Amino acid sequence: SRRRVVITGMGMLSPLGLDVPSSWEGILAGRSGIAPIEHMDLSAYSTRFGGSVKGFNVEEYLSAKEARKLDLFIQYGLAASFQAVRDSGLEVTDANRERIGVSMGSGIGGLTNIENNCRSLFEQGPRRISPFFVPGSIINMVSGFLSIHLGLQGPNYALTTAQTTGTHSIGMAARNIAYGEADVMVAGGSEMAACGLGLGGFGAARALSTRNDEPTRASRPWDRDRDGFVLSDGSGALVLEELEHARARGARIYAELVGFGMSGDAFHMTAPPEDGAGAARCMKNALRDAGLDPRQVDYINAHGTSTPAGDIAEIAAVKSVFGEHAHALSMSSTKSMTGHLLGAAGAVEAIFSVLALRDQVAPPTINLDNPDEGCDLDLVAHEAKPRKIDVALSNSFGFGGTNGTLVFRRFA
Amino acid sequence: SRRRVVITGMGMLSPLGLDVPSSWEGILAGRSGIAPIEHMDLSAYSTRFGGSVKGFNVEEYLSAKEARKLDLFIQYGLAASFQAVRDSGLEVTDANRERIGVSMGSGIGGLTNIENNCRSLFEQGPRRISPFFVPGSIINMVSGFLSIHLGLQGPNYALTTAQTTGTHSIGMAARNIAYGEADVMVAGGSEMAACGLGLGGFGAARALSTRNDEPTRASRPWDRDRDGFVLSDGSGALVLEELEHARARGARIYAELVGFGMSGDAFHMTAPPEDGAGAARCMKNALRDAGLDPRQVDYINAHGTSTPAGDIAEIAAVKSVFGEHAHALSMSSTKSMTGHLLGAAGAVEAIFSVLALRDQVAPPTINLDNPDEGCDLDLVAHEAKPRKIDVALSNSFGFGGTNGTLVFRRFA
Numbered sequence: 001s002r003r004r005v006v007i008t009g010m011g012m013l014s015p016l017g018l019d020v021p022s023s024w025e026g027i028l029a030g031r032s033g034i035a036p037i038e039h040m041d042l043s044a045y046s047t048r049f050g051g052s053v054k055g056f057n058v059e060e061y062l063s064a065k066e067a068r069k070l071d072l073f074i075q076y077g078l079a080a081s082f083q084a085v086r087d088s089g090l091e092v093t094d095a096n097r098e099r100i101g102v103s104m105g106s107g108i109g110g111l112t113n114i115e116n117n118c119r120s121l122f123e124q125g126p127r128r129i130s131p132f133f134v135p136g137s138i139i140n141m142v143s144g145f146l147s148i149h150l151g152l153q154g155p156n157y158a159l160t161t162a163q164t165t166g167t168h169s170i171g172m173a174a175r176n177i178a179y180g181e182a183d184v185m186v187a188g189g190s191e192m193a194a195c196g197l198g199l200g201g202f203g204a205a206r207a208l209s210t211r212n213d214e215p216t217r218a219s220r221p222w223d224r225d226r227d228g229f230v231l232s233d234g235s236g237a238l239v240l241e242e243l244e245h246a247r248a249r250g251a252r253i254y255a256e257l258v259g260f261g262m263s264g265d266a267f268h269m270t271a272p273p274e275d276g277a278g279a280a281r282c283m284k285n286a287l288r289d290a291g292l293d294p295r296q297v298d299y300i301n302a303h304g305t306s307t308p309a310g311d312i313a314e315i316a317a318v319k320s321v322f323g324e325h326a327h328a329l330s331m332s333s334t335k336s337m338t339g340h341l342l343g344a345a346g347a348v349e350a351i352f353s354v355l356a357l358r359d360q361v362a363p364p365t366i367n368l369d370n371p372d373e374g375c376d377l378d379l380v381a382h383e384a385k386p387r388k389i390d391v392a393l394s395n396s397f398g399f400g401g402t403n404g405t406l407v408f409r410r411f412a
Numbered sequence: 413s414r415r416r417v418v419i420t421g422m423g424m425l426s427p428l429g430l431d432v433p434s435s436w437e438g439i440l441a442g443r444s445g446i447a448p449i450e451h452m453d454l455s456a457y458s459t460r461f462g463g464s465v466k467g468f469n470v471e472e473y474l475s476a477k478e479a480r481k482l483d484l485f486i487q488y489g490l491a492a493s494f495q496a497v498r499d500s501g502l503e504v505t506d507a508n509r510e511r512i513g514v515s516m517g518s519g520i521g522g523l524t525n526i527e528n529n530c531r532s533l534f535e536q537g538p539r540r541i542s543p544f545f546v547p548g549s550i551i552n553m554v555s556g557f558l559s560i561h562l563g564l565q566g567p568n569y570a571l572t573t574a575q576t577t578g579t580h581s582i583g584m585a586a587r588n589i590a591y592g593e594a595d596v597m598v599a600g601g602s603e604m605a606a607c608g609l610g611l612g613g614f615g616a617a618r619a620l621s622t623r624n625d626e627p628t629r630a631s632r633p634w635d636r637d638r639d640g641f642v643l644s645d646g647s648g649a650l651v652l653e654e655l656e657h658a659r660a661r662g663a664r665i666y667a668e669l670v671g672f673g674m675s676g677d678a679f680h681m682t683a684p685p686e687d688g689a690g691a692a693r694c695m696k697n698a699l700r701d702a703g704l705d706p707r708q709v710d711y712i713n714a715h716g717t718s719t720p721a722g723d724i725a726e727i728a729a730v731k732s733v734f735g736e737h738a739h740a741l742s743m744s745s746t747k748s749m750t751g752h753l754l755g756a757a758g759a760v761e762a763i764f765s766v767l768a769l770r771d772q773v774a775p776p777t778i779n780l781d782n783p784d785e786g787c788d789l790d791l792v793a794h795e796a797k798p799r800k801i802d803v804a805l806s807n808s809f810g811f812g813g814t815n816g817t818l819v820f821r822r823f824a
C-alpha cells in the first residue's frame with residue numbers, strides 16, 4: 001500500500017499567459033496564443049508561426065547575471081517552478097529540505113543555446129564557446145538550479161520522453177511521494193524549440209501545419225482540414241504533496257493525483273498505430289492504477305495535436321478503452337488554443353485538467369469546424385462546456401511510441 | 413509489497429572494447445582506452461584526446477539504411493541494449509511484452525547530429541536539415557527504437573541527469589520492477605559528446621584534463637597532479653528482472669540490486685561541496701534502502717572522475733558514511749582506464765561493480781602514483797586486487813548537484 005498525492009501549487013508560462021490564471025482565462029474564452037514568430041527571419045521556412053511566450057520578464061525570477069547563463073527552456077521551467085512553490089505556500093526548512101525533490105523535464109532542451117554556441121564555434125572556433133554552455137543547456141538544470149536556489153535536497157532528476165515528458169515527470173514524481181521517497185515534489189516540464197533547428201527539424205519531417213495565412217486556425221484537432229501540429233513554447237510545474245503533509249500545514253488542495261499509466265506502442269518512430277492500441281493500454285494502466293472503472297471518467301484532456309494519423313488514433317483508443325461511455329465523457333484538445341508545447345505539453349495540460357476539476361468545465365477544442373470521419377465524440381467543439389467532472393484524464397504520446405496518462409480526481 | 417530485482421543480462425560499448433568481456437579484461441589488466449581523437453581535427457582545442465569506441469560496426473545490429481538516420485549515442489545505446497537482451501536469454505512474447513520496458517538515458521544525447529544539422533542550417537539554410545534530425549537526435553529514442561525492434565510495450569522512458577544518468581536509469585527501472593509496474597527493464601545509458609560543441613564546451617568550463625603529451629596518464633583519480641576529467645564515449649545496458657520471474661525461467665543471475673539512493677547537493681551547478689555532504693546523504697539513503705550495516709560494503713566503484721574538487725569530496729563522503737570501515741573496504745575509479753562516459757558512466761560502472769561481485773576482484777585505479785592529502789584509503793592503486801566482495805556500491809554525481817548510488821550484492 002501507498003500514500004495519497006495531492007496538488008497544492010501550480011505555475012505556468014504559455015502562449016496564452018505568463019501565469020496559470022491568465023492562461024486558464026484564455027483557455028475558457030477559446031482564445032488562440034498562435035501568431036507569426038517575431039525577432040527571427042523565417043523567410044526560408046515552410047512554417048512562420050507558433051505559440052510564443054509573450055512579454056516574459058526573467059528578472060522577476062533571476063538576476064540578469066544568472067539568466068544569461070541559462071537557455072530559455074531552463075528560464076521558462078524555473079519561472080513555472082517558482083510560481084508553483086509560491087502558489088503552494090510551502091516553507092522549506094532544515095526539518096523538511098531532504099523530503100523535497102524536483103523532476104522538471106524537457107523533450108529537446110537547449111536548442112537556442114546550442115544554435116548560438118554553434119554560430120560562435122563555426123565563425124570564430126571553440127575559444128568563443130561560453131563557459132556555461134554545458135550546465136546552461138542540459139535538461140536536468142531546471143531541477144538543478146531550482147534545488148540550489150530553494151535548498152531542495154530530495155530526489156533530483158529530469159525525464160526526457162519527447163512529447164510525453166510533462167506527463168511522465170508528474171507521474172514518476174507522484175510515485176516518489178506514494179512510496180515515501182519524498183513528501184513534496186515540483187514536477188512538470190519546459191520547452192523552447194521555436195528556433196531554426198526546431199521549426200527546421202519538425203518542418204523537414206513535414207510534421208508542422210504550414211497554414212501561414214491563418215495562424216490562429218492552424219491547430220484544429222480532429223478537423224478534416226488539419227495538416228500537422230503547431231510548435232509552442234512554455235512551461236508547467238505542479239507541487240505534488242503527500243496528503244497528510246498537506247493537511248498538517250493547512251495547504252489549499254486543488255485535486256488528487258490518483259492514477260499514472262505508461263506504455264510503449266512498439267510500432268513506429270514518429271506515428272502511432274491507426275487503432276491507437278498503445279494509447280489504449282496506457283489509459284487502461286492509469287485507470288487500474290487509480291482503481292477506477294472507465295465509467296468514472298468525465299473529462300479527457302487529449303494529446304490531440306492536430307496531426308492526421310495522431311488525432312484519429314486517439315479517438316480509436318478512447319472508444320476501445322471506454323466503449324459507449326466514450327460518447328458520455330467530454331474530450332477536448334487545449335492544443336487547439338496553445339499549440340503543442342512538446343515536453344511542456346503534459347505539464348500545462350495536467351494543470352488545465354486540474355482546473356477543469358476546480359471549475360467544473362470542459363475546455364473547448366477551437367477550430368473544430370468539420371469533424372473528420374469517426375470523430376463523433378463530445379469533442380467540446382468551439383465553446384467551453386460547464387458540466388460535472390469528478391475524474392479527469394490527461395494523455396501524452398511521444399516519438400518512440402512512449403505514452404503517458406495521468407488520472408486526477410476531485411478531493412474532499 | 414516491494415519485489416526483489418536481479419541482473420540477468422549486461423551489454424557494453426567502451427573505450428576498452430565492443431562488448432562486456434573485452435571491456436572487463438581491459439579493466440582487470442589495468443589497460444587505458446584513452447587516445448588522441450582521430451575522427452576530427454582538434455589542433456584549435458586545449459584537449460585533443462578522449463575515450464573513443466574503436467572499430468564499432470553498427471551493421472552487427474542494424475541495417476546501414478536505419479543506422480545512417482541515428483546519432484552515434486543512439487547506435488551505442490541499441491548495441492549495448494541488444495547485447496544485454498541477448499545475454500539475458502529473455503524471450504519477448506504476447507504473454508510478457510507489456511511487462512518489459514526500457515529506461516536508457518543520455519547526458520547530452522545527439523550533439524554530433526545537432527552540430528552537423530546546425531552547420532547545414534547556417535552554411536546553407538533550413539531546407540538542408542535532415543527529416544530525421546528530431547527522431548535521430550533526442551534522448552528518449554534509445555528507449556523508443558529498442559522497444560520498436562524488440563516489441564517492448566512496458567514503461568518506456570529516458571532520464572537525463574548529466575553524469576548521473578546511467579545510475580538513475582538503472583535505479584528507477586529497478587523501482588518499476590520492485591513496485592510491480594514491470595517484470596523486466598532494459599536500463600542504462602549511452603553517450604557520444606566528442607564533437608566540437610562537446611570538447612569545446614567542457615574545455616570552455618576548464619573541466620577537462622589538458623595532458624595531451626600522455627593521454628593514457630591524464631585520468632588519475634585522487635592523484636595530486638589530476639587536472640580534470642577525460643571525455644569518453646560508449647554505452648552500458650543491464651536487464652533487470654523480478655527475482656521470481658528470473659528463477660521461474662531458469663535465468664543466469666549475475667547479482668541482486670538491493671539498494672538505490674538519490675539526493676541533491678543544492679550547492680553549485682558544476683562542483684560538489686568540499687565535504688561531499690550530498691554524496692554522503694545519497695550513499696546513506698542507498699544503504700538504508702538495502703537494509704545494510706555500512707560495514708557490509710566490501711567494494712566501492714567511485715564516481716572518481718579525476719577532478720580536483722570532486723575526487724577529494726568523494727573521500728570525505730566515504731569517510732563520513734563508513735567511519736573506520738572506510739579503511740577496510742576497497743574503493744577504485746575505473747574512470748582511470750575508461751575515462752568519463754558522462755550519462756553512460758553509471759551504466760558501465762554498474763556493470764563493472766556486478767563483475768567485481770562475479771569474479772571477486774577490485775579493479776585498479778591506474779595512474780594513482782602520488783595519492784593526495786587525506787586520500788589514504790585502499791584505492792587499489794595500479795593493479796587489480798583479488799578480495800572478498802559480498803556488497804558493491806557504485807556512485808554517480810552530476811551537474812546540478814544530482815547524486816545516485818546503487819548497491820548490488822552476490823545472489824545465493
Ligand SMILES: CC(=O)Nc1cccc(C(=O)O)c1C
Binds near residue numbers: 305
Ligand atoms: C508515436 C507517436 O508519434 N505518437 C504520437 C501520437 C500523436 C501525436 C504525437 C505528437 O506529439 O506529435 C505523437 C508523438
Ligand SMILES: CC(=O)Nc1cccc(C(=O)O)c1C
Binds near residue numbers: 575680682719811813
Ligand atoms: C555537482 C558536481 O559537479 N558533482 C560532481 C562531482 C564529481 C565529479 C563530477 C563529474 O562528473 O565530473 C561531478 C559532476
